[PDB]
Symmetry: D2
Subunit: 215 residues, 4 copies
């Protein structure tokens, strides 16, 4: 089965955990996958591991600062330059707090918001600019548990519902995934399998909503 056959796909946070599991599952299902990661070194490690699994598959990797819309746009532009289009944007990157509320620093809080909310907005915005005249595309936003208490989780859910209803006219689907607690309990593959379904044409009826995955 090849549920995402020939779908040009970007996976943010694609060097570890759910993201990396999604990269494998998407390659298995016929996608043309590119990963974004935190640093180019982490990206290159993940690309080497993917090459161990899929020696014949081309996989691009980039490390834009997700908090910079310009950097995200440049990296999206390179993917579109290679393949001519972007079919699926998976805003999967997210972080968790070290601390509970009473002890979280202003700097940690803003950093969580920066990755979990601004990063997802940036990925969605950039993917939209790329897909808006194609009358086809899927943007999947991951609403990860904040660690603090969630706040960032609910923001991505709101982002997903609002954006989905606003651009429904353009035939771009926008869908969320709210995972529970994952193993480095859900396995990462169990979340990635949901990405897979949502990216596929089997989910053509699903937009402007978020799927809870708990299990």
């Amino acid at each position: 089965m090849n549920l995402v056959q020939d779908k040009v796909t970007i996976i943010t946070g694609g060097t570890r955990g759910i993201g990396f599991a999604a990269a494998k599952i998407f390659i298995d299902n016929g996608a043309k996958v590119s990963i974004f990661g935190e640093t180019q070194e982490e990206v290159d490690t993940a690309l080497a591991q993917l090459k161990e699994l899929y020696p014949e598959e081309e996989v691009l990797g980039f490390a834009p600062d997700l908090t910079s819309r310009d950097a995200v746009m440049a990296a999206v532009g390179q993917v579109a330059q290679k393949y001519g289009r972007l079919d699926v944007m998976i805003n999967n990157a997210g972080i968790t707090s070290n601390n509970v509320f009473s002890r979280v620093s202003e700097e940690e809080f803003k950093h969580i918001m920066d990755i979990n909310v601004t990063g997802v907005f940036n990925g969605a915005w950039c993917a939209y600019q790329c897909m808006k005249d194609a009358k086809k595309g899927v943007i999947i936003n991951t609403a990860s548990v904040t660690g603090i208490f969630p706040a960032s989780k609910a923001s991505v859910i709101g982002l997903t519902h609002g954006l989905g209803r606003e651009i429904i006219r353009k035939n771009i689907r926008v869908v969320g995934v709210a995972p529970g607690v994952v193993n480095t309990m859900l396995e990462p593959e169990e979340i990635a399998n949901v990405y897979l379904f949502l990216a596929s044409d089997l989910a053509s009826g699903i937009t402007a909503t978020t799927v809870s995955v708990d299990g």
Copy 2:
């Protein structure tokens, strides 16, 4: 692809619309499908149409009164008798009101509750009795738009969340589907494709929640 290969499946309201579309899609994906319908004549018409499409496929059909837990249990028992087990219960049957609130009769309202809430509870309860010692199973509850204003929709959603968390221990998944407006606009296949994903092992991480399908 055979996302529900060898899954013994019952689809309520399986003679028309979403239900019938699900019957076809499930047969295509390797399931052993049985349909329940409103009357045995409607069931036999649907079975004849399925035989036109799949001349070699065995498909059982029954017409238990969904408001009678005993009748539902008997029909579930016949399926388990044929196949030795029940893997997937799809409580898809639902009805819509003729009238808006101010004009709906007490009799129409109770009838909607009877099919849309009691019928789904009966199907879920009966499927649970059948699956409870198997440590495997999926119950999918459809929360259809009431027509009145939903009420029945939200009841099935609550039923799905409560039941799912209660029997999570038994490794039975319980999931809901809340479809939007369907064409006799979403096509029925677009809803049935969600049933398919949720019945499959790709949805192993999904339980005690409802997926909105609007689109």
Copy 3:
């Protein structure tokens, strides 16, 4: 303070618990209160207790079968006959299951649905017929925890949202209350205080939604 001064109010399930606490609080706040209860004997006991607290207050009591829309309409008609109008309908009556899901009888389940969903619909429908030409009124629906696991809770929430948006044009507010676990932990007064606020003109901006009171 007299937050519901001269508001003609009906409280279903008004002989015990939250309902009875609401009767007292509403009388204290200047309402003209009538209670509905399960039987006329229970009603008369509650009326005697209210007279102990408020010797000068008139309080009517009725015991319509909440599952019979005709009986509810007759009892609403008597209140409107006494006072000329109905300002506030509080569909507070609800029951809980003895049993968990696997052991609940078909008869217990239908009885819970009958009181918790049909009864609330009947109260809302009857109050609407009474209030629809007044361009003023509040219907408060209580969505109580099913006891089973939810189902009835979510149905009343859906009922409240749908009905509220449908009759917003008529300047009738429809609002829900979803209480947590109450003491015969929340005290009953803590729920009744929310009824009070929602019935008052301070809640004029609140309709087609449900307030959770947990905690």
Copy 4:
């Protein structure tokens, strides 16, 4: 009636709209009110207008940068210094986007997040440090419509639910308000009346949830 008698209250964004309406209503109901605003000049204008209405009432005003947790903490510290305590924190300040999604600038988006999410977190965190040993307090978070499409709205809702459940042990209530479209349609007083109820002891049963005020 004096629903918040002697409650030391801070209202962010208290110089206009809902905030200013809340200042008046809270003063009327016996609170000791302090307002935070965008600039000290806007604050002084609002204080002059409040003095026109309440010549004998003391009202403090501050203009901390809500995006700076240190500045918010200093201003909360001045209020606690004047009155010895903080009873009610109302994180009411919020902004709306000029632009829809496709045209919103990275700078506008971050600014909205900064006020609508970081500002509310800062206010809540600072109020918590102040109230945590008092075993009494209310934090009200306003989840305002983003303007963009939601995102900030859902983040405050998540913040409110998570924080409320985390500090329920401390007898500090945390509650949200999600207003609809307001007149400079709901009037600002209709939202402020909800703040009033939620700050009062009538809402003692309400925490870790958000009230929608639409309507």
